[PDB]
């Protein structure tokens with residue numbers, strides 16, 4: 111996409127959980143299940159506000175535990191998240207360090223979703239004792255996502271991806287150039 115960001119509607123991803131998604135990089139939180147996506151897909155950098163991932167909805171499915179490769183299941187449910195946040199290339203390497211020259215993380219995954227625990231998404235997705243997984247994602251209509259957006263936290267906040275056709279398309283837009 112514009113800026114060199116790698117923004118595909120479907121693919122393979124790794125998955126983790128995180129706390130504290132109420133002040134996220136898109137500038138609006140949401141009450142439904144939400145995630146941060148790795149910088150190369152988010153479409154912005156820390157401090158620059160929203161990228162084109164903001165507001166888009168994705169169905170996430172875990173199908174492997176990379177730390178326990180002998181584990182065959184059960185995995186969690188498929189969930190639909192709204193992307194509200196950035197998992198930055200600086201400070202979140204093993205999982206979110208994908209760049210244009212090295213587009214996969216340490217698990218060989220070209221995307222990463224950090225699923226917010228606060229609002230319940232991670233409890234639906236991660237079995238007890240298995241808090242990091244790999245699997246798939248597919249962008250879906252936000253008709254498939256339950257929840258309500260939060261209020262704008264600063265000027266330029268954006269979740270307009272929530273009404274956009276799937277990538278390739280432009281809603282909030284990308285900021286600057288993707289990490290190299």
Ligand SMILES: OC[C@H]1O[C@@H](O[C@H]2[C@H](O)[C@@H](O)[C@H](O[C@H]3[C@H](O)[C@@H](O)[C@H](O[C@H]4[C@H](O)[C@@H](O)[C@H](O[C@H]5[C@H](O)[C@@H](O)[C@@H](O)O[C@@H]5CO)O[C@@H]4CO)O[C@@H]3CO)O[C@@H]2CO)[C@H](O)[C@@H](O)[C@@H]1O
Pocket residue numbers: 125126127128129175177178180181197201202203204205206224239240241242
């Ligand atoms: O930066 C992104 C994001 O990270 C968030 O934290 C992540 C963290 O990055 C990630 O490394 C961490 O991964 C945990 C994982 O959640 C947990 O399930 C896993 O537990 C393993 C355990 O390590 C193994 O010892 C155990 O092996 C057993 C075998 O299963 C069994 O068959 C037998 O062989 O005995 C073995 C020993 O008991 O399996 C467990 C399950 O696989 O350990 C990983 C490494 O610590 O996950 C967290 C949370 O997602 C962070 O919160 C966020 O803020 C940040 O943005």
Ligand SMILES: OC[C@H]1O[C@@H](O[C@H]2[C@H](O)[C@@H](O)[C@H](O[C@H]3[C@H](O)[C@@H](O)[C@H](O[C@H]4[C@H](O)[C@@H](O)[C@H](O[C@H]5[C@H](O)[C@@H](O)[C@H](O)O[C@@H]5CO)O[C@@H]4CO)O[C@@H]3CO)O[C@@H]2CO)[C@H](O)[C@@H](O)[C@@H]1O
Pocket residue numbers: 128129130131133134135136137146155156157158159160195196197198201202224263264265266267
């Ligand atoms: O008034 C001056 C100027 O302001 C502009 O608006 C600014 C606004 O002032 C800033 O507060 C705002 O800052 C946001 C950053 O742009 C955004 O990158 C950052 O995103 C964080 C997110 O908060 C955080 O949850 C996320 O955490 C990941 C962590 O890295 C992990 O440790 C954690 O566990 O898990 C998550 C998921 O992986 O990281 C990101 C990235 O650091 O959030 C800030 C607060 O919302 O930026 C605005 C835009 O520049 C305004 O637009 C101008 O008009 C005005 O003049």
Ligand SMILES: CC(CCO)CCO
Pocket residue numbers: 117118119120277278
């Ligand atoms: C070929 C595309 C899906 C159909 O529009 C790739 C999605 O990013």
Ligand SMILES: CC(CCO)CCO
Pocket residue numbers: 131132139140141229260
């Ligand atoms: C859980 C929500 C309560 C207000 O709707 C906010 C989470 O961002």
Ligand SMILES: CC(CCO)CCO
Pocket residue numbers: 184185186187233234235236237238
């Ligand atoms: C995360 C657990 C409950 C599903 O919501 C795994 C059970 O499959």
